[PDB]
Amino acid sequence: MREIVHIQAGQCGNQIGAKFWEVISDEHGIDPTGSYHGDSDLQLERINVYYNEATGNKYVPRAILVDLEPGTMDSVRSGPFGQIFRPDNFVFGQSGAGNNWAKGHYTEGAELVDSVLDVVRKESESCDCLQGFQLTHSLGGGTGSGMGTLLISKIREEYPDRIMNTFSVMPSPKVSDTVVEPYNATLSVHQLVENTDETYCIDNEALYDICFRTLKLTTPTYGDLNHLVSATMSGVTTCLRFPGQLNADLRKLAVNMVPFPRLHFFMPGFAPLTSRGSQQYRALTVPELTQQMFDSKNMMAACDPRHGRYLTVAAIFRGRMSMKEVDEQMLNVQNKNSSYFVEWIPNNVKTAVCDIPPRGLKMSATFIGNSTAIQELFKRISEQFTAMFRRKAFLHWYTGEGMDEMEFTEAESNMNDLVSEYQQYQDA
Amino acid sequence: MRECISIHVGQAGVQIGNACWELYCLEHGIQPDGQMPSDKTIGGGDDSFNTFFSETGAGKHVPRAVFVDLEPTVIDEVRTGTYRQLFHPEQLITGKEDAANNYARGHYTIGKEIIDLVLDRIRKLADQCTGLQGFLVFHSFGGGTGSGFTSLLMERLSVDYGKKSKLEFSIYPAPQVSTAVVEPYNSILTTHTTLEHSDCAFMVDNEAIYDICRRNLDIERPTYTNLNRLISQIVSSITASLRFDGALNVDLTEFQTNLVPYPRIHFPLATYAPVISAEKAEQLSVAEITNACFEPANQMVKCDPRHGKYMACCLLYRGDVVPKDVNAAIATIKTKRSIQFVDWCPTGFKVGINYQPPTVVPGGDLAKVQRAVCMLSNTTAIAEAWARLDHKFDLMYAKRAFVHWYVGEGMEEGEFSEAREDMAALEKDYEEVGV
Amino acid sequence: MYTFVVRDENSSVYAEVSRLLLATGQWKRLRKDNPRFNLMLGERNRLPFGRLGHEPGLVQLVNYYRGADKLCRKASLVKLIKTSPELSESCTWFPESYVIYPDEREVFLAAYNRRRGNVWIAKSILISSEASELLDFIDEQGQVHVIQKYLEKPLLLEPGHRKFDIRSWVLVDHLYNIYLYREGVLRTSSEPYNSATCHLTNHCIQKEYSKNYGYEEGNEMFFEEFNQYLMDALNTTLENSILLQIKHIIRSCLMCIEPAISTKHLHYQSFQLFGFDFMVDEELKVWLIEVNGAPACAQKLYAELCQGIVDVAISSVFPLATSIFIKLHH
Amino acid sequence: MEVIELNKCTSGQSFEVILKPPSDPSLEEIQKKLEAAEERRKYQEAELLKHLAE
Numbered sequence A: 001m002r003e004i005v006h007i008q009a010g011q012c013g014n015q016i017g018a019k020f021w022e023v024i025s026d027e028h029g030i031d032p033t034g035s036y037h038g039d040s041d042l043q044l045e046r047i048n049v050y051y052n053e054a055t056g057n058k059y060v061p062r063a064i065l066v067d068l069e070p071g072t073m074d075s076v077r078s079g080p081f082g083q084i085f086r087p088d089n090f091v092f093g094q095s096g097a098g099n100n101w102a103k104g105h106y107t108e109g110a111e112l113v114d115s116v117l118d119v120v121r122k123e124s125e126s127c128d129c130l131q132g133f134q135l136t137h138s139l140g141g142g143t144g145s146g147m148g149t150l151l152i153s154k155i156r157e158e159y160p161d162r163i164m165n166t167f168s169v170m171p172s173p174k175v176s177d178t179v180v181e182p183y184n185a186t187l188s189v190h191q192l193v194e195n196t197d198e199t200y201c202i203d204n205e206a207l208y209d210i211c212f213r214t215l216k217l218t219t220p221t222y223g224d225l226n227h228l229v230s231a232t233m234s235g236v237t238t239c240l241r242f243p244g245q246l247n248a249d250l251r252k253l254a255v256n257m258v259p260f261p262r263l264h265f266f267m268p269g270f271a272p273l274t275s276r277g278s279q280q281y282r283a284l285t286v287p288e289l290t291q292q293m294f295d296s297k298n299m300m301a302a303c304d305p306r307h308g309r310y311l312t313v314a315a316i317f318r319g320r321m322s323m324k325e326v327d328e329q330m331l332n333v334q335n336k337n338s339s340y341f342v343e344w345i346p347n348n349v350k351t352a353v354c355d356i357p358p359r360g361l362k363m364s365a366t367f368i369g370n371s372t373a374i375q376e377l378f379k380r381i382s383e384q385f386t387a388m389f390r391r392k393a394f395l396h397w398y399t400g401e402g403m404d405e406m407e408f409t410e411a412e413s414n415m416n417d418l419v420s421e422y423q424q425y426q427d428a
Numbered sequence B: 001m002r003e004c005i006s007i008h009v010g011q012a013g014v015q016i017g018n019a020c021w022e023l024y025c026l027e028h029g030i031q032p033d034g035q036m037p038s039d040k041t042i043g044g045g046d047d048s049f050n051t052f053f054s055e056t057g058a059g060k061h062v063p064r065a066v067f068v069d070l071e072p073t074v075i076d077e078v079r080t081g082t083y084r085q086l087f088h089p090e091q092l093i094t095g096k097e098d099a100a101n102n103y104a105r106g107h108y109t110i111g112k113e114i115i116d117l118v119l120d121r122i123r124k125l126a127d128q129c130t131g132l133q134g135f136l137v138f139h140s141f142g143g144g145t146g147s148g149f150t151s152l153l154m155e156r157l158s159v160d161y162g163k164k165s166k167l168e169f170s171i172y173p174a175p176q177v178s179t180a181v182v183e184p185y186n187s188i189l190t191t192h193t194t195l196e197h198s199d200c201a202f203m204v205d206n207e208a209i210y211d212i213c214r215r216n217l218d219i220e221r222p223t224y225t226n227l228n229r230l231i232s233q234i235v236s237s238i239t240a241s242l243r244f245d246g247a248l249n250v251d252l253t254e255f256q257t258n259l260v261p262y263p264r265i266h267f268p269l270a271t272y273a274p275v276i277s278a279e280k281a282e283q284l285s286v287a288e289i290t291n292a293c294f295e296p297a298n299q300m301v302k303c304d305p306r307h308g309k310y311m312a313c314c315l316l317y318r319g320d321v322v323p324k325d326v327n328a329a330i331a332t333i334k335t336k337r338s339i340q341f342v343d344w345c346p347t348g349f350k351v352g353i354n355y356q357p358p359t360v361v362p363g364g365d366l367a368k369v370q371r372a373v374c375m376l377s378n379t380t381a382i383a384e385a386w387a388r389l390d391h392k393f394d395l396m397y398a399k400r401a402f403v404h405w406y407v408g409e410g411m412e413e414g415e416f417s418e419a420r421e422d423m424a425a426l427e428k429d430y431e432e433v434g435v
Numbered sequence C: 001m002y003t004f005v006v007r008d009e010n011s012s013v014y015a016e017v018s019r020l021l022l023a024t025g026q027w028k029r030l031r032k033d034n035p036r037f038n039l040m041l042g043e044r045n046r047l048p049f050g051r052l053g054h055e056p057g058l059v060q061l062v063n064y065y066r067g068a069d070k071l072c073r074k075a076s077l078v079k080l081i082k083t084s085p086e087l088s089e090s091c092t093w094f095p096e097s098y099v100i101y102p103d104e105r106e107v108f109l110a111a112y113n114r115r116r117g118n119v120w121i122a123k124s125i126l127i128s129s130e131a132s133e134l135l136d137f138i139d140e141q142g143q144v145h146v147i148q149k150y151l152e153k154p155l156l157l158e159p160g161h162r163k164f165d166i167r168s169w170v171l172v173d174h175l176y177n178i179y180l181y182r183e184g185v186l187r188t189s190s191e192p193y194n195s196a197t198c199h200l201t202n203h204c205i206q207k208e209y210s211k212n213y214g215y216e217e218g219n220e221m222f223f224e225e226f227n228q229y230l231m232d233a234l235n236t237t238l239e240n241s242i243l244l245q246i247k248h249i250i251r252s253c254l255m256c257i258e259p260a261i262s263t264k265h266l267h268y269q270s271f272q273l274f275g276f277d278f279m280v281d282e283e284l285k286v287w288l289i290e291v292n293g294a295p296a297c298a299q300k301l302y303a304e305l306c307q308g309i310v311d312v313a314i315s316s317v318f319p320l321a322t323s324i325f326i327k328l329h330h
Numbered sequence D: 001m002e003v004i005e006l007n008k009c010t011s012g013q014s015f016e017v018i019l020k021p022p023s024d025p026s027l028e029e030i031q032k033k034l035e036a037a038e039e040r041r042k043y044q045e046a047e048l049l050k051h052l053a054e
Ligand SMILES: CC(=O)OC1=C(c2cccc3ncccc23)Oc2cc3ccccc3cc2-n2cccc21
Pocket: A236, A237, A238, A239, A240, A245, A246, A247, A248, A249, A250, A252, A253, A256, A257, A312, A313, A314, A315, A316, A347, A348, A349, A350, A351, A352, A368, B101, B179, B180, B181
């Protein structure tokens, strides 16, 4: 019984977070009222990883909703699975964070962080064996980015020997709320490098391109992007919450995926790519699932893997399929394209299979890549950051909250260090 | 009679332990509830099988075994399995979180907090021993618990039972069914730290067992259950002499005496035959199964014995086998095949025959056969497996990949190079002997 | 699409092989230390055989037979023939040889004194009629040597009155089929043989004393020409007078070590190309000189031979999407 | 070729066939290891907590 404590902060973190909980709740046969109405008890074997039992046999998510304004969290509680969340676990202020990392991290957020920690402590102390935390949030805003990383730093101080995992949404000018998103993202990446073990980089640039090019969506909305995020988050947690999965947990993923402490930013992928309300009727063959999940057009990070090399890879197939075929299909990928795998980590590709498929797909596959091509994402953010910072543009929003220019210079330098470090291992 | 205690560590050691003890009960006629109708001395015993089983006043036959795993999932299925009644609760020891595939976490961080508990449980089984020979330790190389805690337990057993023998049954890591990318790290770390504490170790390469289950059993995607029922046959072949009346390998000391002339070179190569698919309509002869022991495809570790030198050979037969038929096969094998020995060792074969044919799990994958042989031969050829493994270690360690996970558990980086350097000595020891 | 690596840059035979494989568009070359390879062109010395055949989903093949060196080292070739009931003492095609270290000194001396023509040859390069001269030259060096009866009556090519030796290229595939390249070559001596430079023909040694060159180009005569000579001079064919014995020695040697180097039931597969060197005496008897485990080819036959390696040795295991070899059955 | 030490009994027999004659740490030292590793663990952690305190 290895419990995970889920935290979702800010608008983006709570929207994907809410989408995540209703999706996996349906996969485990948990209805919006928290009562189980499933058919197979395979859904209940490891249900405790994410759910508490409470009384009456009603499962309650081990989830904490954080935000600096109430708007998004009122929407969650209004939602269909809004009644499933423990009401004491809504922690919010009224001031807001105004898309300002400084407000989330140093001023507004500091006033409310202790209250969140009190809820975290409550959940953790009733865990038979707490394995770690997972946080959903964006990096372009103020609350999930500025306050999110503040929580992560304080959680690590109190639980120094637990795994810290995040689902982090990277900003893109293609889906931009404000011009200061590069400032907020750069400041946050520095925190993630120090204080997370695993981060799934979810790039809104990629989610948009998938919706526009692959899914043929003229004007994609956040709902469409979150549908891709929803399917990914379900894929990369399947092995954590279903039986017969070698007791997979957060720590073993980090041990095998992360050869160097700072290089822990994963590229997620998913196949088949499916639009919301667009359900197709022919299931993919195992060859098809394998090819598409390694295809650049199925990556959620907006980096070309052929521009770098895989340090490690984890994949999970979901459905009733030929495992022997799954084995052959994965082996040929590595044997065919062995140049895109660092030769100094033998057998760096792990394959898992789960018999239970996700809703609306007879089979699917999810990709978790630790690729040096991720440096393309941090280079993109670095160029945007520097273009404004070389003219100190929009900085007064941050100096007015107590920040100094030096702290920007240091976040810029660390991200450039991170980039050159990924390029170091692209030599081999 | 002199008792033997089996210690099962980690997932591999526990699940292989389940396969073995299930098979022991079938070979000895012991019901899942421990009752043994054949045994006519109730509550007491000086019999051959009492080296592995104790007896309660109620006639229950209890294995002299302890099962240790840092996480409870694997042992809990033993606690609720079809042999739950056999073991008593004190013999099953579990924690709450595993070693995360980290040798350092199994040895240093988590080991220190449970090592004393395990020893006391072990002591409580030794108390019931009027004459303890030593221990049989089952574990994997690649697991964090199998590698890390085992090495620590072997350190303390040498302290608390200095006079006793200790034999290992070790699972060598194979990519086909492996678990962690760092299994070469854990393999070298535990082999270095356990070398001076193990008198004789039988490595089983999952690659070999996997390929045998594919070719001979026609199983497309072998499972741990498939592998373990086959591994348990081999382990049964190797321990039968301790459990049945006989004159070859009657105590653990004989394994070292007959198979290990050089202390550091104590990894006999095991070869088995025949492995026959259950769902099939040919009964191999003595010459045929004896000759099969010299085919690479039947060895527990894949390697080429034609290019090494033998230091000792044992032939353990079970079933319809008479000595004359064995010598007729040996002289016939000695000619056509090149079995080069080392100058300082005689070209000799120690032979053992047990008349009860191999027992196979009812409904399992192996067909019942009239005669089987298990060859134990200490060949320098097994050094190929050390070289394979040491190379994969060299590839990762040259970049220091994943080392931070071990150092974070309190292990110093120097233990890596200290371990690798020991392995480099091991390889040169083999080369001087093999020329 | 298949994959292969390269670990012997010096090989002229397999440099051409790699070039042909790449051209087909169905083979890709990888770095030397990349384990995800189908084919390996390994190194001459201490090739890591122990690491082959352990890659799931990869059929692996290498251009050397482990243990075939016992045939390609002078000390071990002599030993192989003396201690193999398949060869001597019934072997009549190998010059009387002894291995002495700088055994078998006593046995060599007894044979020499008993014979007392007695012209021998020691190699690991001295030719003396007195046994005492050879050993003094041997003890100086620290390498093991073999004493062998020098063929006093070698067959001489006329005109020119010159000595020669025959090189035959043999290819053994993963099935242990034995393939003899139909095109051989004679390495002749420009200097006329003198009973008391011209005694050793290794081409390289021939450029040192360039007495003559283009009776033949590079002191090389191929079978079509050599056959015509035998017909005109001796009223025989190359097939009857010499090739029957070459095919026998080749078969004899490779079937002897077959059970020790065969990869029929191994986790990886082997093939290798051998260079047999024969002598021919006055009475058209063929003598086995030595076996080369890594031979070069004659420029004129590089293309044809290297192509045949790809066809029968490589594409036979890794097929793509009339023969030049003579199959010696067994 | 040659057989020696033939032992028979109800369950079976065993023998040897010859074909060719031939031509420490203490308990406290382990503690000095386990405790040395625990201290390095706690030192590295104090470096973290102090870093977070900054
Ligand atoms: C193999 C399995 O069954 O699960 C595991 C997963 C896993 C795989 C896919 C998606 C996941 N998502 C969340 C957590 C774990 C996984 O990580 C791993 C990733 C690995 C990646 C490369 C090499 C070895 C790995 C081992 C694991 N490893 C060790 C024990 C259990 C697991």
